């Protein structure tokens, strides 16, 4: 029976070597989860039952696992994405008046549910507010005001410390910053420094989204390391 | 009209189950002697998984066990010698279930890909990829080398034919995402618990739901079947484990304590059915006396939450797999 | 009087280091790339508290080295080895933190347990080469009459060293690790401040200073005063008296006991200590 | 879809069910009869134990 034991030990050694190689490969890559709404525009972002996209930037491998279908209000599978580097959230900021409760309020509720999750008490969320151009068109020219669908907009004023675009209107900047603050309040209330939210204003034509995700992942890992050593 | 009839039928079921309650299980069982303190020490620790483990399944020989993790690998261990017999890479990194065929030739896995993959060990290529589930798979079991039962997140359980690769029959009428599944020793019946509190009993051959039990309050994360074949214990997220009886049609006992508030992820029974071993989200397992609902011991060797738990067919060993990627075999 | 405090120091050093080592060894969750360096540092401090400090206390109190000349040379070599190993392990931990913070994407590839073992072994081999090789081969032997009288007699032992060996040992042990640690910690402070400014700019609606202050202040206030006078007594023969030299050496020794209190404080280590005790 | 639910409830309405006392007695008898061959309940002797 010694020969069988020796052969099994040799097989174990080969499997262990393969496991070490695969461990290097696995630790090299970073995992991201795309959890936008169906209308928000996940297709536009992913263009640049489960869909996996492997994109690398600056010799760093990123894997974005976006769940397809599975249109269930209850999300039991979300506990699987407990070790992802970040959760990429895509929200349509131009849907403040669409009903198919409003779409923006549904996105707010979804973001609050993701933030206040026991398993996701450490995972940071990268926020993309897509369809900026449509939001600008609706706020500027449209006769439907965000105040009617969001009563708190009446008392809201634009922040003193802000970064308006080089060619951008005042009222639309007010609307954009209000929509950003709506998510930022939920971000700031619960998490006590373990995870943060990175709100980015994305347009359909913007191609720098990959760079934004790379920078946000770098900041996330830097902040995690700093908090681990009590430097932040 | 139809709703009123359904309400009347539900009231009739409640009244009929009330009339069968001759005496509580605790009243009968309090006379028999207690099990006493049970101490279990980790005999073997299996290392080699990178990410969290969800599922395990002891082989029929009680020597080989297969474990599934988010690494995209399906490692088959040898529990006696702590040696990895096989390490099967998987197409999809996300898996949530695994199974070991009774013959030992076949191994299955599944996850968020909605596809059940069946592997042929003795030949590690993919024997068949089973598609047809709308949602993620949660648990798989083997009836024989040709029939497999999968429970998915589309609120439907299905029975497949491996050679044909088609759903022979589909179990529908379930209102929640099925999370766990277990088979009877005679393989004639099986049970399934879902996100909705109700846990149903099915008939494999006919394909209809014979009975329904709704004692719980939260998601039914785990289910196990009593060795006698006339009972089954379910673990939910409300920090309660309950023992149901097929013949009585209602629960017999409730395993819970005020100290523990976390949900139960995995449950299993000992060979004699006296000890109900249940995993917990509070980082360690608990051993419950199934007869008196008195805890007999703990299994506090794990660092992360316990996602799977099993007992050998011979009953010699208990293996628990946690999210810390370490399989620990207790005895 | 002096015996009580030195005994307490020995007990504290040994107790802290053994707690750290057994917490790392017993619990699998505590085994990490940084924790391997922590274990190496704890081992250095433990061998310090076992051999270096009790023998020095006995030499001070008894006023005579009852042990043989070979044992005296061995004690001196072990002292140098332990000091330099501890300081270089602190430098390596600082470098590991700097690489983890500054380059987070490549930190996983740069640091590996197999590679961490190489780093620890290289540190200990450097410590051995700088401590055992010159002392055992008697290359640190001085030339003046006082050193000859002290080393010829086996009853008494005092540290008399060459200018070359003293300067080389000081540079290898403290000053180079001091420079490396100051640079890397100034950098990590800069990233901490930049991240704090970024958070303030994003969420308009101290800790790094305190942490780095403790980490650098204890090390500097423990070892810099000793190494300044170590250089000075060579530079000027009559500048530094023996009592001041020994007092500063023991002040540097106390750093070994203080070190776990600053390097092993964390929720995981606290939980492990509670479980053990 | 209510017709399917009411039909299923009617199918589940009429099953011959035994009293809880009989079922509990059967479970107790099964636990007592097979208690001897339970390595977990009664620790196996160190000899012939596969793991230790
Ligand atoms: C006997 N005391 C020794 C003498 C010189 C010396 C010490 C520590 C570290 C060094 O690098 C040294 O060169 C002291 O602990």
């Amino acid at each position: 029976q010694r020969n069988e034991e020796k052969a099994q030990r040799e097989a174990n050694k080969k499997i262990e070597k393969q496991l070490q190689k695969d461990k290097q490969v696995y630790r090299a890559t970073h995992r991201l989860l795309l959890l936008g709404a169906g209308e928000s525009g996940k297709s536009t972002i992913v263009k640049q039952g489960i869909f996996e996209t492997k994109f690398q930037v600056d010799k760093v491998n990123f894997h974005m696992f976006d769940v397809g279908g599975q249109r269930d209000e209850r999300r039991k599978w979300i506990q699987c994405f407990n070790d992802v580097t970040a959760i990429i959230f895509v929200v349509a900021s131009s849907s403040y008046n669409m009903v198919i409760t409003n779409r923006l309020q549904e996105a707010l509720n979804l973001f609050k549910s993701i933030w206040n999750n026991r398993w996701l008490r450490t995972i940071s969320v990268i926020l993309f507010l897509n369809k900026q151009d449509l939001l600008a068109e609706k706020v500027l020219a449209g006769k439907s005001k965000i105040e009617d669908y969001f009563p708190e907009f009446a008392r809201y004023t634009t922040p003193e410390d802000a970064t308006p675009e080089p060619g951008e209107d005042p009222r639309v900047t007010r609307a954009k910053y209000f929509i950003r603050d709506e998510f930022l309040r939920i971000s700031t209330a619960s998490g006590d420094g373990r995870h943060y939210c990175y709100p980015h204003f994305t347009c359909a034509v913007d191609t720098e989204n990959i760079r934004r995700v790379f920078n946000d992942c770098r900041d996330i890992i830097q902040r995690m390391h700093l908090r681990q050593y009590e430097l932040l | 009209q139809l709703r009123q009839e359904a309400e009347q039928l539900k009231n009739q079921i409640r009244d009929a189950r009330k009339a069968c309650a001759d005496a509580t299980l605790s009243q009968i069982t309090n006379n028999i002697d207690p099990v006493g303190r049970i101490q279990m020490r980790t005999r073997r620790t299996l290392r080699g998984h990178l990410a969290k483990i969800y599922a395990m399944h002891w082989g029929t020989d009680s020597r080989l066990l297969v474990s599934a993790s988010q690494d995209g690998k399906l490692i088959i261990w040898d529990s006696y010698t702590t040696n990895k017999v096989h390490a099967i890479p998987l197409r999809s990194s996300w898996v949530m279930t695994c199974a070991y065929a009774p013959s030992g030739n076949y191994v299955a896995c599944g996850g968020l890909d909605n596809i059940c993959s069946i592997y042929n060990l003795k030949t590690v290529r993919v024997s068949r990829e089973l598609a047809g589930h709308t949602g993620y798979l949660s648990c798989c079991r083997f009836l024989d080398d040709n029939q497999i039962v999968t429970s998915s997140g589309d609120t439907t359980c299905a029975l497949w034919d491996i050679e044909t690769g088609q759903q022979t029959t589909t179990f529908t009428g379930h209102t929640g995402d099925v999370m766990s599944l277990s088979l009877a020793p005679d393989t004639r019946l099986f049970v399934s618990g879902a996100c909705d509190a109700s846990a149903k009993l099915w008939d494999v051959r006919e394909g209809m739901c014979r009975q329904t039990f709704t004692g719980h309050e939260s998601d039914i994360n785990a289910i196990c079947f009593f060795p006698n074949g006339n009972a089954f214990a379910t673990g939910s997220d409300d920090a309660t484990c309950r023992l149901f009886d097929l013949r009585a049609d209602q629960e017999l006992m409730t395993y819970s304590h005020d100290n523990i508030i976390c949900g139960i992820t995995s449950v299993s029974f000992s060979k004699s059915g006296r000890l109900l071993l249940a995993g917990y989200d509070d980082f360690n397992c608990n051993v419950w006396d199934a007869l008196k609902a008195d805890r007999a011991g703990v299994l506090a060797g794990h660092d992360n939450r316990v996602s799977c738990l099993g007992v050998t067919d011979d009953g010699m060993a208990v293996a628990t797999g946690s999210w810390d990627s370490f399989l620990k075999i207790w005895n | 009087g002096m015996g009580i405090v030195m005994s307490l120091i020995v007990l504290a050093i040994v107790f802290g280091n053994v707690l750290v080592i057994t917490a790392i060894a017993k619990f699998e969750r505590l085994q990490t790339v940084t924790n391997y360096f922590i274990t190496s540092l704890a081992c250095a401090d433990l061998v310090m508290g076992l051999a270096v400090v009790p023998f020095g206390a006995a030499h001070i109190l008894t006023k005579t080295w009852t042990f043989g000349n070979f044992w005296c040379e061995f004690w001196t070599s072990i002292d140098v080895l332990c000091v330099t190993a501890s300081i270089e392990t602190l430098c390596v931990i600082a470098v590991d933190r700097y690489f983890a913070i500054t380059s987070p994407f490549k930190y996983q590839s740069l640091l590996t347990k197999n590679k961490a073992r190489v780093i620890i072994l290289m540190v200990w081999i450097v410590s051995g080469l700088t401590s055992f090789l010159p002392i055992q081969m008697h290359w640190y032997r001085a030339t003046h009459q006082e050193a000859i009288n002290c080393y010829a007699e086996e009853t008494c032992c005092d540290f008399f060293t060459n200018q070359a060996y003293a300067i080389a040992s000081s540079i290898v042990s403290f000053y180079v690790p001091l420079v490396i640690m100051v640079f890397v910690y100034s950098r990590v402070f800069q990233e901490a401040k930049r991240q704090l400014q970024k958070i303030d700019k994003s969420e308009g609606r101290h800790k790094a200073l305190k942490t780095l202050g403790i980490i650098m202040g204890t090390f500097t206030l423990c070892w810099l005063p000793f190494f300044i006078v170590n250089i000075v007594h060579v530079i000027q023969d009559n500048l530094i008296r023996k009592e001041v030299y020994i007092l500063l050496n023991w002040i540097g020794y106390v750093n070994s006991g203080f070190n776990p209190l600053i390097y092993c404080r964390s929720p995981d280590f606290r939980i492990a200590f509670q479980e053990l005790l | 879809q209510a017709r399917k639910l009411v039909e299923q409830l009617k199918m589940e309405a009429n099953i011959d069910r035994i009293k809880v006392s009989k079922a509990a007695a059967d479970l107790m008898a099964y636990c007592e009869a097979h208690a001897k061959e339970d390595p977990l309940l009664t620790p196996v002797p160190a000899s012939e134990n596969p793991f230790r």
Side-chain angles (χ1 to χ4, degrees), chain A residues 30 60 62 180-181 184-185 187-188 196-197 214 217-219 221-223 225-226 229 231-232, chain C residues 34 97 100-105 107-108 188 191-192 195-196 198-199 202-203 205 208 211-212:
Chain A
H30 290 84
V60 181
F62 292 97
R180 199 174 52 94
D181 291 327
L184 269 180
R185 284 196 263 262
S187 178
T188 51
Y196 294 90
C197 178
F214 169 83
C217 279
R218 180 179 171 89
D219 279 316
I221 309 178
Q222 264 188 31
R223 286 172 182 175
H225 285 170
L226 287 160
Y229 306 136
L231 293 174
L232 191 145
Chain C
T34 307
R97 301 186 165 180
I101 299 173
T102 303
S103 58
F105 283 135
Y107 167 60
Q108 278 305 331
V188 304
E191 286 88 6
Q195 288 295 323
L196 272 181
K198 214 163 301 193
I199 295 169
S202 277
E203 285 146 359
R205 59 191 59 77
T211 304
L212 290 177

Side-chain angles (χ1 to χ4, degrees), chain C residues 1-3 5-6 9-10 12-25 27 29-44 46-72 74-95 97-105 107-108 110 112 115-116 118-121 123-130 132-136 138-142 144 147 151-152 157 159-192 194-199 202-205 208-209 211-220 222-234 240 244-263 265-267 269 272-273 276-277:
Chain C
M2 293 180 183
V5 295
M6 302 190 156
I9 283 172
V10 169
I13 290 166
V14 176
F15 189 60
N17 292 131
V18 301
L19 294 174
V20 170
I21 292 173
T22 193
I24 297 155
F27 299 85
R29 78 179 73 90
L30 283 187
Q31 282 133 20
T32 318
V33 180
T34 307
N35 274 312
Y36 292 138
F37 308 127
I38 298 290
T39 314
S40 173
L41 166 77
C43 292
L46 178 55
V47 57
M48 181 145 278
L50 286 188
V52 161
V53 176
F55 280 4
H59 169 276
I60 290 172
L61 295 176
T62 295
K63 294 212 321 163
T64 302
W65 192 248
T66 184
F67 314 93
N69 224 27
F70 170 77
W71 290 112
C72 177
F74 196 78
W75 167 63
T76 289
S77 166
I78 286 294
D79 181 18
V80 181
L81 162 77
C82 295
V83 172
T84 182
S86 170
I87 304 184
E88 296 209 13
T89 311
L90 294 178
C91 170
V92 163
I93 295 175
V95 169
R97 301 186 165 180
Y98 162 81
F99 271 130
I101 299 173
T102 303
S103 58
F105 283 135
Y107 167 60
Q108 278 305 331
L110 290 174
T112 310
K115 193 181 292 292
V118 181
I119 300 298
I120 296 168
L121 264 292
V123 162
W124 281 92
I125 297 169
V126 168
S127 294
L129 294 174
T130 196
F132 265 95
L133 189 62
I135 286 166
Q136 286 303 337
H138 281 272
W139 303 342
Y140 84 112
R141 180 68 178 269
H144 45 88
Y151 287 137
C157 279
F159 193 76
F160 297 92
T161 187
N162 297 115
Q163 152 176 349
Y165 176 74
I167 288 184
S169 181
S170 61
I171 297 169
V172 166
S173 294
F174 172 80
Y175 290 113
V176 167
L178 178 74
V179 167
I180 298 182
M181 293 177 70
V182 164
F183 162 83
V184 298
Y185 281 160
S186 68
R187 294 296 180 188
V188 304
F189 184 77
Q190 273 184 21
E191 286 88 6
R194 154 161 50 260
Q195 288 295 323
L196 272 181
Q197 303 303 340
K198 214 163 301 193
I199 295 169
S202 277
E203 285 146 359
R205 59 191 59 77
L209 259 177
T211 304
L212 290 177
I214 300 141
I215 291 175
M216 291 335 278
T218 181
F219 169 64
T220 300
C222 280
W223 277 124
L224 185 51
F226 165 70
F227 278 98
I228 301 299
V229 308
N230 186 20
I231 296 297
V232 160
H233 96 277
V234 175
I240 300 300
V244 181
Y245 187 97
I246 300 180
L247 164 66
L248 295 191
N249 213 12
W250 278 74
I251 288 303
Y253 288 163
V254 178
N255 165 38
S256 294
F258 278 146
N259 224 27
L261 268 59
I262 62 170
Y263 265 71
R265 70 181 162 73
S266 62
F269 263 115
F273 294 156
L276 290 173
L277 274 74

